[PDB]
Ligand binder design. Structure first.
Ligand SMILES: Nc1ncnc2c1ncn2[C@@H]1O[C@H](COP(=O)(O)OP(=O)(O)NP(=O)(O)O)[C@@H](O)[C@H]1O
Ligand SMILES: Nc1ncnc2c1ncn2[C@@H]1O[C@H](COP(=O)(O)OP(=O)(O)NP(=O)(O)O)[C@@H](O)[C@H]1O
Ligand SMILES: Nc1ncnc2c1ncn2[C@@H]1O[C@H](COP(=O)(O)OS(=O)(=O)O)[C@@H](O)[C@H]1O
Ligand SMILES: Nc1ncnc2c1ncn2[C@@H]1O[C@H](COP(=O)(O)OS(=O)(=O)O)[C@@H](O)[C@H]1O
Ligand SMILES: [Mg+2]
Ligand SMILES: [Mg+2]
Lengths: 173, 173
């Protein structure tokens, strides 16, 4: 009766939202009920003035964790796509969420700067925003997440299949 | 597939949490699945240093609304027990939640002051806290909520019965 949470962490431009949306389309095509919690989407719904200092990011992460916890424990698959740049926060999330599936889209900096349709890295290079996660903002890489995908070497389709494969191995699907 | 939210609004000491807990107990004995969102509980879990200015309460209310909306659209009865002192915020909640059941525990200030086991009215009356909702902090009373109960004239049992009666007339149970 307890479902699972796919927690996709990574720096800006790693491909988190893309993978989250592809997974949603696939799982709902199979007849599953799914909720998407995207960092940018949740911020602009709930607190669009919230900034990106550490305490602010932490409060926002705590909100997303509790949202996933409540949905998951009631049978609802939840897909989270938030930067979540610190190891300690993802360990907190793993403790709050029983069936926790950490997904890390790994992508080199030089590719991430060329995969920036919103222009965050461009703004950052011009000093217009500071501490962008992935450039001058720190990102603590996961050591052994349930799934690592190299978004510079895999297609979105292969990323989806790799997550689904691990989900079946866990017995969650 | 769409469930409902019982939104219990009122000033401090009105009896919101007591009624929320009695409803939780009653509905789960009927074999229902229920999530409880209490203002004090959510605050100490998600942001215990959040204060009580209008903008701070408004953020917290938006968080609660989003959690209730996500749970209820997946078939999960949600019981909210938060002060929610302004009509504008409860109207926002009503727009965000299809099956919205507003419940107002109405209770005179004189009774509320004698029903203060946490001692908030005492702390307020000695200037220790400012703007306690129900004393000097404002509360906009609901005009035509789905259920009004007078907690100075009705037992908790009778409050539960009244809510359940309204839920069956709406077709929600
Ligand atoms: N496997 C992939 N292969 C090639 N391009 C990709 C891949 N995944 C994403 N892209 C593109 O990379 C861009 C950024 O992807 P996106 O899902 O927005 O990353 P993000 O991690 O959510 N960024 P942010 O929300 O700012 O933290 C988009 O143009 C995607 O279409
Ligand atoms: N129908 C009732 N009749 C008599 N006493 C009651 C009734 N309901 C609650 N009480 C008591 O009134 C006190 C306050 O009730 P409570 O549920 O904590 O109110 P509240 O609105 O949640 N306060 P707050 O969380 O600070 O905004 C408690 O001691 C209850 O036991
Ligand atoms: N210093 C920053 N300033 C502005 N935006 C940032 C910054 N760092 C990351 N971002 C982007 O802001 C969007 C929302 O990020 P989140 O996932 O919500 O980050 S998090 O650290 O709080 O978890 C994302 O597109 C993110 O890449
Ligand atoms: N000025 C205040 N200062 C401290 N506590 C308050 C104040 N006003 C109300 N409270 C109490 O703080 C607890 C949590 O309140 P909430 O339900 O979360 O209020 S709300 O306005 O933000 O919706 C409740 O016990 C509430 O009665
Ligand atoms: Mg994104
Ligand atoms: Mg209470």
């Amino acid at each position: 009766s307890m479902s699972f949470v796919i927690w996709i962490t990574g720096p800006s431009g790693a491909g988190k939202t893309t993978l989250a949306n592809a997974l949603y389309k696939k799982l709902e095509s199979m007849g599953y009920r799914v909720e998407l919690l995207d960092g940018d989407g949740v911020r602009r719904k709930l607190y669009p003035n919230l900034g990106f200092s550490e305490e602010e990011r932490w409060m926002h992460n705590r909100v997303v964790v509790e949202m996933a916890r409540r949905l998951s424990r009631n049978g609802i698959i939840t897909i989270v796509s938030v930067v979540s740049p610190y190891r300690a926060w993802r360990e907190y999330a793993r403790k709050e969420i029983e069936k926790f599936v950490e997904v890390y889209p790994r992508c080199p900096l030089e590719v991430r700067m060329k995969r920036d349709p919103k222009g965050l890295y461009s703004k950052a290079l011009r000093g217009e925003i500071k501490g962008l996660t992935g450039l001058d903002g720190e990102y603590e890489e996961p050591e052994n997440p349930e799934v690592v995908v190299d978004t510079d070497k895999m297609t979105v389709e292969e990323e989806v299949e790799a997550v689904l494969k691990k989900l079946m191995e866990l017995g969650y699907l």
